[PDB]
Amino acid sequence: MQIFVKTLTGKTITLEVEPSDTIENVKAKIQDKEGIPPDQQRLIFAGKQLEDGRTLSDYNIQKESTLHLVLRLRGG
Amino acid sequence: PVLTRTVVPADNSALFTSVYYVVEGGVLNPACAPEMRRLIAQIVASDPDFYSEAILGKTNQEYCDWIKRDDTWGGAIEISILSKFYQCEICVVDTQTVRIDRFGEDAGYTKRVLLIYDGIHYDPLQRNFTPPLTIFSSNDDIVLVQALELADEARRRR
């Protein structure tokens, strides 16, 4: 199953996975690809934030669907 | 030439002050922050489809009041917005993982500015030689490497 992830920077990341991986494990595969720490990631799909400890396809995420990465990076 | 960090106050507005400093040519002024906050809310309010509750984390109006506060931190949302506004590539180098996040990499702008992030605070980066250089060619990839070295030297220190 192949998905696309569009980041805040504009980059479109294509992630190789299966519809029974944890969201915290998606953040693990994302970190193996972009070096972004999972504790800075916020995954979102279909106007809904994805919660850790849950599988994809639980929210109708099919192959060739587009999910969203929002970096936190708050700093003052 | 050498890449250096310029220290801006950690008064909750460091992101705004750091951005202002590098787009404006090496101008340090923590007063730009309210109008920079006001711009942001202005942009976010004008498109509640793109800046929905999911993307933001709060509701679109709730977020606009939040970012207007003087004690609330800017993050990647503000960077992305500012990037589009200043028509610039804002590159953020992390001291914690020594990595670069290029905001606006997909637009093809003619300039890029560099910020340094340590998890709670932003500082701006500049070149020294003669006034400092803060804006660079988006084809200048030596500053990218120069910043990494800088960030990693920081990382060592911690």
Name the residue ranges covered by the structural domains of chain B: 1-158
Angle at B71 between CA B98 and CA B115, to 5 degrees: 25
Q: Which two tokens stand for residue B108?
A: 């093809």
CB burial of A16-55 (b: ≥16 within 10 Å; e: otherwise) equals eeeeebebebbbeebbeebebbbebbbbbbeeeebeeeee
CATH number at residue A3: 3.10.20.90
B chain contacts of residue A8, beta-carbon cutoff 8 Å? 76-77, 79-80, 103
Dihedral angle computed from the Cα positions of residues B5, B9, B12 and B17, in that order, rounded to the nearest 10 degrees: -60
Domain B1-158 class in CATH? alpha beta
Indicate the resolution in Å.
3.0
The H or E element spanning position B155 is helix B142-157
The whole domain housing A62 covers 1-76
How determined? X-ray
Q: Number of H helices and number of E strands within chain A?
A: 1, 4
- The alpha-carbon gap from B15 to the nearest alpha carbon of chain A, in Å, equals 6
Q: Which two tokens stand for residue B53?
A: 């509750």
Helices B32-45 and B76-85, interaxial angle, to 10°?
Answer: 90
| Whole-Å CA distances, B82 to A75, B79, B86, B126 | 15, 5, 6, 19
A chain contacts of residue B118, beta-carbon cutoff 8 Å? 75
Residues composing chain A: 76
Count the alpha carbons within 13 Å of B120 in the hemisphere toward its beta carbon.
Answer: 4
CB A61 within 8 A of CB A3: yes
Could you please report the per-residue DSSP string of B94-107?
ETTT--EEEETTTT
Please compute Rg for chain B using Cα positions: 15
Chain B residue with CA closest to A70: the answer is: B55
Contact between chains at B54 and A74 (C-beta distance less than 8 A): no
CB B88 within 8 A of CB B142: no
Q: Which of A35, A42, A73 is facing B79, going by the closest CB pair?
A: A73
CB B131 within 8 A of CB B28: no
Report how many domains make up chain A. 1
Question: What contacts 24+ positions apart, CB below 8 Å, involve A22-25?
Answer: A22/A52, A22/A53, A22/A54, A22/A55, A23/A50, A23/A51, A23/A52, A23/A53, A23/A54, A23/A55, A23/A56, A24/A52, A24/A53
B134 SS3 class: coil
CB B63 within 8 A of CB B45: no
Instruction: Report the distance separating Cα B66 and Cα B83, nearest Å.
Output: 20
Phi, psi of B17 (to 5 degrees): -70, -40
CB B134 within 8 A of CB B25: yes
Q: Number of H helices and number of E strands within chain B?
A: 6, 6
Q: Taking the mean position of all CA atoms in its chain, how far away is CA B76?
A: 8
